[PDB]
Every structure is written in structure tokens, then in C-alpha cells.
């Protein structure tokens, strides 16, 4: 009428909106919706004073017109004509024992013309692929209507049709169009499009189980209505490239390259850049669901770095009642994309020397790299900010590399230098610098991106700093002990406690976390599958050694930073006494008292915090293996 | 039946209840008691649970 004319241009623009190469999608002329002459539904003397039996002759020979559309000659189509539905009015001037037979053969014109006018509307290219196509279906049952009343009309005019005849014949077909009726009412009613309309089907298909008039009538409804549909999975499935003309699928491209390039951290093929409607999937496909979008986005993310891909076969199959071959074929082709991607991911531009070149400098298999470069660094280290300048620093990694022999894994190349400027405070300052903060960077590639991110670097950088200051500390207090190839004997004990906590704690982590899990992370990489394994993989690793750690604690052990700012204390003045004396008793003696007290206080609270967490009791055990400093007070309680 | 004693395993551990859960073979049940005799002759209320179970895994 009128109220069909907007429906039309908004969803028009919503797919305007949706491509930017599908531009200016066209409509049908206006005089197809100004005429009324498409639709199958486009003299008379006082009924009252005829005969009985020519008054039948009469009935049947208007009722045969309405039946398929036109109207009738005692029979009017009304003009009031409420929503998606027909009315007509028989004359009430009409015998009442015809009449009465008469309402009982009208049912199927009302649920012919309804039926009709659909058939206009869902065609045209606004309203997609699917309704076009189960429009296409239901206009050959429209067709087979004219059919019959045609040869009821040859039969009429050689006088041998009767008013019991014709309604015993249109019985039979008055189900037919009762059912696509109330199709008709379902798909316009709840604004259907795309496969929200294949749902329906799904469901009316189904429903229909102790017919089989009706369920054949829908059966081939939704093979035909799929047809259209499987053109869209095609597309989607065997290739990274959709032409989508108009669009009512599940998946939709949305661009996501305005924010990232060279490098996604959003890792944006899993988040937004390329995702699902879960409103448009037909109710049997949402098992599916995920596996769908990738088996299309592995071949965007293998075509993005310059490497063809290729389905492995094509299928078109259509639906069949309950039974499914595609299901089969989803699983086929999205493990052919994650096989093939998982293979090229492991030779051509390979992660797993990667990743050994990341083992060597954050989680650091070699320490010959850093002894050289802590002795060939403290002096400007030591100093504060402003103090430094990036070229001395990127000498000295080319020189310690060079000079070590971390210089013949392939992946040292991008290889950076920075600081931390926030430092401990960052888990859940830039006043120094290389006393507090020091770290590398690397940056990374589009098949190394998705795996590792900006995130994962950060992390294994923080992991560093805090193992950079333990490392820092112990050389300290070398130095201090080779400064005495008078003194006090509490200053030996305490020089020496203060070394083995701190090496012990280094080698706790070390043989705890860094070799185990790296032990256990070569093992799950050996067995993905997917690129969401080597990711289920990779960030369990990242979580595992966080977490195993000590770096994780709900107050990041104020202990063991109250502790190493005593031990620089340490080594600061016990090397500025040597130095003094070298160009009394007491005060030596007091300043080692001091610490030796502050030491072994925040020696014990740690090991009380450690006995709560309570396998996970040996740092406890190795820590006092020799049964000193083991327990040397009970742990005070409460009087309450 | 053909799942649970293939790719399960139900008889084969069931087998080693019978043997400690029910005490059914004495030498785990003679070796755990004699190397752990003085903690079980003690109070084992004043006794923390992590350190049984740490010695029962080298124990068994």
C-alpha cells in the first residue's frame, strides 16, 4: 500500500552502508508497485427472484474466479483491506442454503490473494537472496491453482459442473494454501530476512510430522530457499573473498585496518574485524558457529602474509530433511585451513627459533650474553636519568652478542633496547635509570603478531626487570667479597647469608619455572592442531610462568624489597669502609648490626608468608636444607 | 563395555583399591607404617596434611 514503499529504501541503506564496492543497489521501477495489475487479483440483475438451480450455476460460476484471485460478479474483494491479509462479501441477498456452502468455500481465496501479494513484495531486491528464491517456490504452486480451475471451467461449460462437484474437488487444495498462508503471515510478521527465514523453515519443517501433505510442502520450500544461502557459504568457507550483493549473513566485514597496521595487538581477525550474527544463523548451523568463521579467516590470515591457500573440494549441497553432509563439510574444510596454516606457521617464517631467541634474553638461556654486558655496564648504569644516551647501549648489545654466542640464531636482528619507566609499581619510577628499569624490545610481523603481541613482550619484560635486580644484587656482593681477598665476624655470616638467599632464590625460579615449563611448552607445540591451540598453548605458558613465579603475590612481597634495598645498603658501606681504612670497631660493628637485624626480620617474615601458601612446600625445603634459620621463632599469636 | 575397558581404564584401576584403599596387600601397608612410625605414634592434630602427602609420594 504505502507503508511497504519504506521498509524497502531503509533496508536499502542498510546495505549501503554494509559494502563500500556494493554501491547504488538498484530497485524496481515504480509502477510496478504503482500498478495493481500484477498481483492474480486485479449487467448483475437482483439474485432473489431467479430459480433455485440457475442461482447455483450462477454461485459456481463466481466462486471459480475468487478462488484463484479476480473477483466475483455476487462476491466483492473489499477495500478496507486490513494488513497482510483479504476479506470478501458475499451478497446476503443470496439463497441462505447455498450461501452457507458458500462460506465454506471462501477460506481458500482469502488464502489465495494474501499468498499473492507476498509473492511481489519478498521478490524484489530488498528483502535478499532467500526470500526471492522461496518466493520462486511458491509461485508454482499459484500456478498449478489456475491450472485446475481452467479445467473445471471446460468442464462447467458443457454443462456438467454443480456447486457439490466443485467444492469436493477444491478440498484437497484448500490445505495447500492454508499452510503457505500461514507461512506467509510467520515471515512477514517477525520482519524475516536472510536466515532468520530459514530458521522458521528449520522449525516449520520439523513441526510437520504427521502430515506429510504439509511437510513435503515445506521441505521443498527450504531446499529451494537454501539454494541461495549455500552460494554464501561457498564463498565464505572456500575462500577469504565474499561478493555478499545483498547482505543477510550470519558473518559481516566490518573493516578494522583504521586502527591498526603492520601489527594487530587488538589480534582483530578474532575480535571484530571479521564476526558473526548470532540472529541470522539458521537454528541448526549455530553448532557450527564458530568453526565457519575459521575456516575463511585462516586463509585471510595465510593470504595476508603473501602465501596461497586453496580449499581442499567444493561441495553446493543442498538441505535434506534432518540430514547433514555439510556439517561433515565444515569440519573437512576448516581442518584443511588450520592444517595447512599450522604448517606453513612452523617452516616459512618459523616461530619456534623464535621463540628460542626469546628464551635467551627475557627467560635467558645464556648468561655469558649478560656478564659481559653487567661488567661492560655498571659504571653508566649506576648513573641517573639524563645521564644516558641510546647509542652506548646499542653498542653494547652488538658487542655482547657478537662477542657471545648468541649471534647464530637467525632472530636477534630487531632486537631494542628501553627501560621500564614505572617500575614494580606497574603490577596489579624514571628517577633512575639502569639502577631502577632495565630491558630490550622486539617487534614483530604479521605471522608472529597473532601469537605474540605487545602484551606478551611487556610481560616477559617485567618478568626480566625483576630477575635483572637479583642478578644486579649478587654481583654486589661478590664484589664485596673479593674486597677482602680487623673485621667483624658477624659481617663474614652475614655477608655470606646475604649471598646464598639471594642465588638461592635465583636458582629456585630457574630450575622451578624457566627449564620445566619450557620443557612443557615444547611438547604442547609438538601437538596444536589449530591457531587455536599454538594460542590456547602459547598463553597458558605466559600464565603458567607468571603465576609459578614469585612474581605474582597479592602484596608483591614488600619483604623482598625492603630486603634487596638492604643488601645495596650492605654493599655500599662495608666497600666504603674498605676503601676509607685503606688510604673503628664500633662503627663498623653497629652499621652490621643494623642490617644483620633488618635482614634477618624481613629473612623471617618471608619465610612465615611462605609457610601460608604452604610440591610447593620445597622452597622451604631447599631454602634451610641444612636445618638453620628453618623455624628460629614459633610465629607469635593473639591473646584474644 | 568396549570404551570403558579400552580407552578407560575401570578393572585395572580398580585393582589398586583392593590393594591399599582396602588394605589388601600388606607390604605397602608394612613399609608406609614402618617408615612413618614416629609420626603416626604421635599426634598428627598437631601435624600439618602437605608433609604426609609429601612423604607418601616417595612412600609409595
Known amino acids: 500500500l504505502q507503508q511497504s514503499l519504506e521498509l524497502k529504501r531503509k533496508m536499502l541503506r542498510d546495505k549501503q552502508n554494509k559494502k563500500n564496492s556494493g554501491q547504488h543497489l538498484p530497485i524496481f521501477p515504480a509502477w510496478v508497485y504503482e500498478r495493481p495489475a500484477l498481483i492474480g487479483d486485479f449487467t448483475a440483475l437482483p439474485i432473489g427472484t431467479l430459480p433455485l438451480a440457475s442461482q447455483e450455476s450462477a454461485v459456481v460460476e463466481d466462486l471459480l474466479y475468487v478462488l484463484v484471485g479476480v473477483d466475483g460478479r455476487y462476491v466483492s474483494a473489499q477495500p478496507l483491506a486490513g494488513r497482510q491479509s483479504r476479506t470478501f462479501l458475499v451478497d446476503p441477498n443470496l439463497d441462505l442454503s447455498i450461501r452457507e456452502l458458500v462460506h465454506r468455500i471462501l477460506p481458500v481465496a482469502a488464502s489465495y490473494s494474501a499468498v499473492t501479494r507476498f509473492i511481489e513484495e519478498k521478490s524484489s531486491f530488498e528483502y535478499g537472496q532467500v526470500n526471492h528464491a522461496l518466493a520462486a517456490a511458491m509461485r508454482t504452486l499459484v500456478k498449478e491453482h489456475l491450472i485446475l480451475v481452467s479445467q473445471l471451467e471446460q468442464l462447467h461449460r458443457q454443462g456438467l459442473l454443480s456447486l457439490q462437484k466443485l467444492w469436493f474437488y477444491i478440498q484437497p ?47 521443498y520450500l527450504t531446499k529451494a530457499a537454501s539454494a541461495p544461502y549455500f552460494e554464501v557459504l561457498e564463498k565464505w568457507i572456500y575462500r577469504g573473498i565474499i561478493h555478499d550483493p545483498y547482505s543477510e549473513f550470519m558473518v559481516e566485514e ?21 564476526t558473526i550474527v548470532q540472529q541470522q544463523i539458521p537454528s541448526f548451523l549455530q553448532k557450527m558457529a564458530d568453526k ?36 561433515e563439510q565444515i569440519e573437512k574444510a576448516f581442518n584443511y585451513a588450520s592444517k595447512v596454516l599450522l604448517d606453513f606457521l612452523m617452516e616459512e617464517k618459523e616461530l619456534v ?18 656478564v659481559h654486558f653487567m661488567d661492560l655496564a655498571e659504571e653508566e648504569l649506576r648513573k641517573p636519568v639524563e645521564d644516558i644516551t641510546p647509542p652506548r647501549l646499542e653498542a653494547l648489545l652488538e658487542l655482547a652478542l657478537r662477542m657471545s654466542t648468541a649471534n647464530t640464531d637467525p632472530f636477534k636482528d630487531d632486537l631494542k633496547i628501553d627501560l621500564m619507566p614505572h617500575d614494580l609499581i606497574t603490577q596489579l619510577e624514571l628517577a633512575l635509570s639502569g639502577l631502577e628499569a632495565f630491558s630490550f624490545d622486539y617487534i614483530v610481523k604479521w605471522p608472529l603478531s597473532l601469537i605474540i603481541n605487545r602484551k606478551a613482550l611487556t610481560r616477559y619484560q617485567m618478568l626480566f626487570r625483576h630477575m635483572f ?19 667483624f665476624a658477624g659481617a663474614f655470616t652475614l655477608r655470606q647469608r646475604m649471598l646464598n638467599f639471594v642465588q638461592n632464590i635465583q636458582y629456585y625460579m630457574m630450575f622451578e619455572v624457566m627449564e620445566p615449563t619450557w620443557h612443557i611448552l615444547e611438547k604442547n607445540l609438538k601437538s596444536a592442531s589449530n591457531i587455536d591451540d599454538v594460542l590456547g598453548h602459547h598463553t597458558g605458558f605466559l600464565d603458567t610462568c607468571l603465576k609459578d613465579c614469585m612474581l605474582t603475590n597479592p602484596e608483591l612481597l614488600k619483604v623482598f624489597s625492603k630486603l634487596m634495598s638492604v643488601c645495596v645498603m650492605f654493599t655500599n658501606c662495608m666497600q666504603k669502609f674498605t676503601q676509607s681504612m685503606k688510604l673503628l670497631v664500633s662503627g663498623f660493628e653497629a652499621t652490621i648490626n643494623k642490617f644483620d637485624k633488618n635482614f634477618s ?13 604452604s610440591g610447593m612446600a620445597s622452597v622451604i625445603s631447599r631454602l634451610d636444607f641444612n636445618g638453620f634459620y628453618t623455624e628460629r621463632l614459633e610465629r607469635l599469636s593473639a591473646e584474644r | 563395555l568396549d570404551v570403558l575397558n579400552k580407552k578407560y581404564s575401570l578393572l585395572d584401576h580398580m585393582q589398586a583399591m583392593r590393594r591399599y584403599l582396602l588394605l589388601g596387600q600388606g607390604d605397602f601397608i608394612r613399609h608406609l607404617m614402618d617408615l612413618l612410625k ?20 616417595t612412600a609409595v
Open chain 1, 292 to 327: 565457519i568463521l575459521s575456516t575463511g579467516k585462516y586463509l585471510n590470515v595465510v593470504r595476508e602474509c603473501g602465501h596461497d591457500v586453496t580449499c581442499p573440494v567444493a561441495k553446493e549441497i543442498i538441505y535434506t530433511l534432518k540430514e547433514r553432509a555439510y556439517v
Open chain 1, 353 to 370: 627459533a623464535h621463540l628460542r631467541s626469546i628464551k635467551r634474553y627475557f627467560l635467558m638461556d645464556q648468561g655469558d650474553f649478560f
Open chain 1, 469 to 487: 635486580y637479583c642478578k644486579h644484587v649478587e654481583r654486589q656482593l661478590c664484589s664485596v667479597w673479593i674486597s677482602n681477598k680487623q673485621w
Open chain 2, 38 to 57: 614416629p609420626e603416626l605414634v604421635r599426634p598428627a592434630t598437631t601435624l600439618y596434611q602437605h608433609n604426609l602427602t609429601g612423604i607418601l609420594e
Open chain 1, 601 to 613: 626480620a624481613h629473612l623471617l617474615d618471608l619465610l612465615a608468608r611462605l609457610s601460608i601458601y
Open chain 1, 173 to 219: 487444495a484448500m490445505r495447500t494454501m492454508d499452510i503457505l498462508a500461514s507461512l506467509a503471515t510467520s515471515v512477514d510478521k517477525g520482519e524475516c530476512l536472510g536466515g532468520s527465514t530459514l530458521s522458521l523453515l528449520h522449525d516449520r519443517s520439523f513441526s510437520y510430522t504427521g502430515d506429510s501433505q504439509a511437510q513435503e510442502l515445506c521441505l
Open chain 1, 254 to 274: 566490518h573493516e578494522l585496518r583504521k586502527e591498526r597496521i603492520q601489527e594487530d595487538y587488538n589480534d582483530k581477525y578474532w575480535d571484530q574485524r571479521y
